[PDB]
């Protein structure tokens, strides 16, 4: 099915022709546009008072990365490199070896936050919820080097945003 958008014929009765003549001379339809913007002047603006008011988000928000721990404090990452393999932008670099106690742990975990496309695949691929994208979106830097995170920066992010990351996961892990 379809419909014509601009297939119409104006009635040629004298009253209609005079109505159009008044519109042409008295600018009637140009004053409706004035009336429409006049109403908006009296509507409450939709502007939030940033940084005191923040736009709403959801638990699934994909922000700054963080490396998580277990309740014991042990690192969750066991150097499986699934996040490194699935990263579309090849933003992750990992190196691992046997730890002093024998555990499988990484000696390098670098995310180039300027290659990353903030897509969430790494947290979808992680079998132990080690790597997550946190809710932080205010981490602008004054240098390109500050965005090349290493394992120390990512662990601090985890120790920093754990109280919030753990709650967001709790509210969304039943959809994953």
């Amino acid at each position: 099915t379809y419909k014509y958008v601009n297939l119409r014929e104006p009635s040629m009765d004298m009253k209609s022709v005079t109505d159009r003549a008044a519109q042409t001379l008295l600018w009637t339809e140009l004053i409706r546009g004035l009336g429409m913007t006049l109403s908006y002047l009296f509507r409450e603006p939709a502007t939030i008072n940033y940084p005191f008011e923040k736009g709403p988000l959801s638990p699934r928000f994909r922000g700054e990365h963080a490396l998580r721990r277990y309740p014991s404090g042990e690192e969750r990452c066991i150097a499986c490199k699934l996040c490194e393999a699935v990263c579309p932008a090849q933003a992750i670099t990992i190196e691992a070896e046997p730890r002093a106690d024998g555990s499988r742990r990484t000696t390098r975990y670098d995310i180039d936050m300027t290659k990353c496309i903030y897509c969430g695949f790494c947290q979808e691929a992680c079998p132990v919820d080690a790597i997550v994208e946190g809710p932080n979106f205010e981490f602008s830097t004054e240098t390109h080097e500050e965005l090349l995170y290493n394992k120390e920066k990512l662990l601090n992010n985890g120790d920093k945003w754990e109280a919030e990351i753990a709650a967001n996961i709790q509210a969304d892990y039943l959809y994953r």
Binding site: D19, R20, L26
Partner: protein
């Protein structure tokens, strides 16, 4: 337990308007011209 999912209410959702609605306003062409001439005549007098 029972499956819980993001589903519509049992009775469905209420009607949603989509058609163009530009209301008719103003006076007729005859009335507007009549008011216009009347203003001129008073102004001239």
């Amino acid at each position: 337990s029972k499956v819980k999912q993001d589903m519509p209410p049992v009775g469905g959702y209420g009607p949603i308007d989509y058609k163009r609605n530009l209301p008719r306003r103003g006076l007729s062409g005859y009335s507007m011209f009549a008011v216009g001439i009347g203003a001129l005549l008073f102004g001239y007098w």
